[PDB]
């Protein structure tokens with residue numbers, strides 16, 4: 123039986139797979155042809171079907187897991203295509219997490235004698251996060267931040283040490299947002315969440331701009347000017363609102379300039395894409411800061427696939443957190459930001 | 475000189491006017507014809523020009539202000555039409571607040587010998603709020619709440635006593651949102667704010683539905699089904715997420731179902747209007763609860779014109795606050811919710 127870990131979310135399925143590379147000549151003969159055909163299929167291809175992708179750059183190599191040396195692979199595909207995934211498998215213990223582990227439980231059991239063990243999506247998130255940072259990213263730091271995030275000529279990616287990670291505020295930006303307070307490896311809680319997450323960005327951008335992919339929405343946003351749609355403090359006061367420390371460039375009302383018909387007719391789709399990104403990202407950063415001040419935690423780490431290949435939101439979260447906290451809070455990011463639930467599920471295999 | 479109080483916001487201008495009704499026969503002769511023509515113009519009409527409206531139902535009668543008995547009137551018009559207002563006035567001390575008091579200061583001074591005194595929009599908000607509740611709404615309570623807000627067959631408007639209003643969390647929903655912690659009549663602070671306010675609802679709804687007025691957007695929203703656009707917890711888990719107390723009906727991702735092309739093509743404009751309202755209202759309620767728990771305040775009052783003739787957002791704020799706080803927080807509302815800044819400005823007249 124292959125060693126899998128699966129996080130079936132509302133939007134994407136994340137899969138962690140451990141490829142053994144210490145296979146002996148005796149183990150290779152005892153390897154069932156269906157087991158060997160799966161390993162060759164997953165290691166010989168980087169695209170699976172029309173929608174499966176292996177993030178090769180994130181692969182952890184020569185990892186010692188469960189007493190075996192092997193490579194840890196990271197694979198993703200849309201939850202919409204899970205029926206295809208299950209149908210291929212109908213032609214083994216699966217530790218599955220996320221909402222889809224419960225919603226599609228009966229569908230997984232159509233696979234003969236498959237044992238499905240459901241694990242909680244936030245248990246696996248914490249366990250997977252702490253594990254990846256503990257084994258490092260092939261010798262490099264798993265955690266990083268943007269140094270001098272307020273100065274763009276100095277803003278640069280720098281490693282960050284999490285050798286004692288407690289306390290920690292984890293902001294999981296998926297379809298929605300979950301915010302966790304991690305006080306210990308066995309003591310964490312979900313402080314709150316918001317429904318304004320990555321699905322809101324992709325959903326609104328599809329309605330406003332007709333974009334057909336997450337990557338295309340980011341590409342439109344990078345070319346836009348969000349101030350064409352948002353109403354700023356300087357649009358209301360003529361400048362800064364100095365009494366309450368609000369700079370003139372601060373957004374007073376997201377999409378607030380779209381109450382005027384003349385501005386709706388001159389705004390571009392790139393502007394609306396950028397305004398959607400800024401609106402979602404700013405709100406997430408503000409909620410994270412409020413929870414951090416309440417939980418008395420100064421280290422806030424952002425995970426989830428909304429930040430995948432999304433440097434604009436990361437730098438915006440970095441600048442916003444630092445500016446509005448007066449330097450008291452730090453925005454942290456992880457190289458395997460979308461796969462920690464799938465890793466945590468895989469780590470539950472010995473417990474079964 | 476007539477007694478005015480003006481709050482020039484990012485979207486609407488709010489005007490409070492004190493009509494003396496204890497005018498003596500001697501004072502009537504000494505009344506300049508321009509002063510008398512203004513009083514007759516404002517008291518004989520409920521619509522001013524094409525965009526001015528007098529909220530007659532909110533008028534306070536037989537109010538003793540500055541040693542005089544009179545009626546307190548409440549008038550509003552779009553900030554976009556302030557040039558018309560100023561031009562009419564060019565054919566008197568004005569206490570003005572809001573962002574427009576600074577942005578349009580030079581425009582007000584085109585009126586001959588007019589003395590403009592700028593006051594802060596949150597000082598006037600606190601002073602105006604405490605004053606109106608202290609003099610009552612013509613004998614009725616200015617403050618009210620929705621009793622049994624979790625049971626729709628029992629949800630009903632009920633008066634609420636604010637005879638000692640401290641501490642108090644004020645949520646000002648205008649173009650954006652400001653959240654204030656009122657510890658005393660001379661001790662209050664702005665804890666935070668969010669750019670997802672009434673301008674976001676009106677701006678997004680105009681882009682998504684082509685609505686041409688705030689009232690038309692509310693009318694579309696009352697006919698829609700927000701679950702056609704939002705992705706729910708039950709869409710991700712197949713039911714409740716019982717481990718973290720998330721019911722199946724809770725919104726997991728606002729507009730999250732709009733990532734699918736087939737659902738974007740079947741959604742109606744009323745559904746998108748309703749989803750925009752629910753999205754803005756839920757986020758405001760969640761931020762209010764987070765600030766209330768942090769500030770250790772259990773009374774949260776919502777003001778601003780986003781809730782004007784908007785019973786859907788009020789009841790949603792009432793149910794959401796009560797449900798997510800497990801009964802610890804109370805959503806409060808005020809009959810003069812949009813005019814407290816204009817009243818507070820008027821009350822600064824003796825200080826000049």
Ligand SMILES: Nc1ncnc2c1ncn2[C@@H]1O[C@H](COP(=O)(O)OP(=O)(O)NP(=O)(O)O)[C@@H](O)[C@H]1O
Pocket residue numbers: 130131132133134135220221295296297298299319320321322323324336426427428429430460710726
């Ligand atoms: N290829 C992609 N397809 C769709 N969304 C993507 C893609 N790449 C990045 N994203 C973004 O990442 C978000 C989904 O992130 P993810 O962490 O996988 O959440 P999820 O687990 O699927 N949803 P949830 O059930 O709430 O956990 C999407 O809403 C997008 O904003």
Ligand SMILES: Nc1ncnc2c1ncn2[C@@H]1O[C@H](COP(=O)(O)OP(=O)(O)NP(=O)(O)O)[C@@H](O)[C@H]1O
Pocket residue numbers: 358374482483484485486487572573647648649650651671672673674675676688778779780781782812
């Ligand atoms: N007739 C209307 N026209 C426009 N908006 C309205 C109207 N009636 C209610 N509203 C809502 O009320 C909001 C404006 O409320 P308001 O409290 O007057 O804010 P503001 O002071 O003008 N903006 P701000 O500068 O941030 O204070 C609008 O964004 C709408 O959502």
Ligand SMILES: CCS(=O)(=O)Nc1ccc(CC(=O)N2CCN(c3ccc(Cl)nn3)CC2)cc1F
Pocket residue numbers: 132221243296297298299300314315316317319707710715720724725726727756757758759760763794795796798
């Ligand atoms: C968790 C994994 S998931 O798959 O189910 N996704 C998912 C689901 C829900 C949410 C939102 C959430 O947590 N909410 C609780 C707090 N809330 C409010 C609202 C009003 C008020 Cl006054 N107070 N609180 C908003 C809703 C985010 C998610 F990312």
Ligand SMILES: CCS(=O)(=O)Nc1ccc(CC(=O)N2CCN(c3ccc(Cl)nn3)CC2)cc1F
Pocket residue numbers: 355358363368372373374375404405406407408411442443444446484573595648649650651652666667668669671
């Ligand atoms: C005040 C009267 S106004 O006319 O100027 N209107 C007005 C103006 C601005 C705002 C928004 C606001 O207060 N913000 C400060 C807090 N913030 C963040 C963002 C990211 C992070 Cl990480 N942390 N905090 C978001 C912006 C609301 C308004 F209603």
Ligand SMILES: [Cl-]
Pocket residue numbers: 238239240
């Ligand atoms: Cl199980």
Ligand SMILES: [Cl-]
Pocket residue numbers: 590591592
């Ligand atoms: Cl002045």
Ligand SMILES: [Mg+2]
Pocket residue numbers: 131132220296297463
């Ligand atoms: Mg997830």
Ligand SMILES: [Mg+2]
Pocket residue numbers: 483484572648649815
């Ligand atoms: Mg205002």
